[PDB]
Symmetry: C2
Subunit: 162 residues, 2 copies
């Protein structure tokens, strides 16, 4: 069975991938990944889907906890980023906006894998309250294979859901 997000030991160079809130990640990808790198957030038996942005926030903050909150305010200055967060084919623009804020607040780097379910629009992102610096560096990869080619992740994790 799937380990919890807190039952893996996150390390520098890890990439954490999330699929759309209702669809998740295709089985063709998941079936070729080791059991230990397919994580599932704990839920009670009769649960229903959690919001994707909440799922990513929970996962990011658990990883950051394991990494001692390096780079946080009132901690010694650290150079560089934490982990890399990957949204596979993100669908709902509000989730992506929330996740952009999350990643900017935590020093995690965000990647999107096309196709997106919305048009990427600086003005729309700004209207939602994001500053340009929060989203200016976000990479959009053409495909999952192109992402793997560009990034060559040391380890790749995938969030699964029931």
């Amino acid at each position: 069975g799937c380990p919890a997000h807190s039952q893996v030991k996150f390390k520098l160079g890890d990439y954490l991938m999330f699929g759309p809130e209702t669809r998740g990640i295709p089985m063709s990808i998941l079936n070729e990944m080791p059991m230990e790198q397919k994580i599932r957030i704990p839920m009670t038996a009769n649960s229903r889907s959690m919001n994707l942005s909440n799922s990513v926030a929970v996962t990011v903050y658990e990883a950051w906890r394991q990494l001692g909150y390096k780079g946080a305010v009132n901690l010694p200055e650290v150079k560089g980023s934490m982990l890399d967060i990957v949204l596979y084919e993100p669908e709902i623009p509000q989730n992506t906006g929330n996740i952009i804020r999350l990643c900017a607040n935590t020093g995690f780097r965000l990647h999107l894998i096309e196709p997106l379910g919305f048009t990427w629009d600086d003005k729309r992102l700004r209207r939602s309250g994001l500053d340009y610096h929060e989203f200016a560096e976000i990479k959009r990869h053409k495909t999952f294979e192109a992402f793997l080619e560009s990034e060559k992740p040391k380890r790749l994790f995938a969030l699964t859901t029931k």
Copy 2:
């Protein structure tokens, strides 16, 4: 300064209170609480406000992690609830909806302290995708003082923000 949400040791009988995403909990309340019970989620220096539902999800899942995910699907059956979650004067309906789902998924009990910034309307809650059992038993307290009188929390935590 404020301990992180993961730098407190949560215990049975704890109540975790969250104020609105735009203004938080009034200083008149916070000033009567011990420093150790005023938690702040870690952020980088130039961070901006995180979505309240993300803040509550992060805090709830960290508390549940400390409590060994008791009552989760892959675990022996447990009869009680976990902690109590309290929204002080919640403003944005979608946050409250997300938090209702979160609490139902984790076995945490939700309380709202009036006044709410939106209508408590079964039809509106249903339209947002919630099932009746998720919201039917949520306690709505007339005031903060009435909440304290009704619930007599063994310990009360409050989320703070910069």
